[PDB]
Curated annotation (Swiss-Prot):
Name used for this protein in its record: Obelin
Molecular-function annotations in GO: calcium ion binding
Function: Ca(2+)-dependent bioluminescence photoprotein. Displays an emission peak at 470 nm (blue light). Trace amounts of calcium ion trigger the intramolecular oxidation of the chromophore, coelenterazine into coelenteramide and CO(2) with the concomitant emission of light.
SMART domains cross-referenced by the UniProt entry: EFh
Pfam families in the record: EF-hand_5, EF-hand_7
Binding site for Ca(2+) 2: 113, 115, 117, 119, 124
Taxonomic placement: Eukaryota, Metazoa, Cnidaria, Hydrozoa, Hydroidolina
GO BP of this protein: bioluminescence
Annotated positions binding Ca(2+) 3: 149, 151, 153, 155, 160
Domain of life, per lineage: Eukaryota
The family this protein is said to belong to: Belongs to the aequorin family.
Family annotation (CDD domains): EFh
Endpoints of the signal sequence: none
């Protein structure tokens, strides 16, 4: 609906080329899970059960885009699959059903919440250095946090964490 907005194209090309480990111009579910799941869960020292839950959510999202283990797909076919999925997930949201992004969101939240508190604080948030994996100054970090904390509660709930961490896949601005 707004998934055909031309601004979406450039963003998606850069992400595709980053997930394409061997640089051959096509991606598999093998390459995606390694970059988007194996790396983060090891970095944050998640438990085996936590890691397994995260992997299930990542496999579900990308299979909905048309991906499978051992199957090579180029950019034009990948983009069309994502459009199809984003449309059908918009309708689920409207029918008061749980979506694939919400389910992936809960799995991520459990890993970052090291004590048992049910909110994410600044010390917990800083533990992961993002996918590009290069750290800016301590001062840019702390202002990015304040920006993500929409109300001024001093911490992050599930809706706030999900929008910053996985917003790339469903919203342009
Ligand atoms: Ca490849
Ligand atoms: Ca906490
Ligand atoms: Ca908050």
């Amino acid at each position: 609906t707004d998934f055909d907005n031309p601004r979406w194209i450039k963003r998606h090309k850069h992400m595709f080329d980053f997930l394409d480990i061997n640089g051959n111009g096509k991606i598999t579910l093998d390459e995606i899970v390694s970059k988007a799941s194996d790396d983060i869960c090891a970095k944050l020292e998640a438990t085996p059960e936590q890691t397994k839950r995260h992997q299930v959510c990542v496999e579900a999202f990308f299979r909905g885009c048309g991906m499978e283990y051992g199957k090579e797909i180029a950019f034009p076919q990948f983009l069309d699959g994502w459009k199809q999925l984003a449309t059908s997930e918009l309708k689920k949201w409207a029918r008061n059903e749980p979506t694939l992004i919400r389910e992936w969101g809960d799995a991520v939240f459990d890993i970052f919440d090291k004590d048992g508190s049910g909110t994410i604080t600044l010390d917990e948030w800083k533990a992961y250095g993002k996918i590009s994996g290069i750290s800016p100054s301590q001062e840019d970090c702390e202002a990015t946090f304040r920006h993500c904390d929409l109300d001024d509660s001093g911490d992050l709930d599930v809706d706030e964490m999900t929008r910053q961490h996985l917003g790339f896949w469903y919203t342009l601005d």
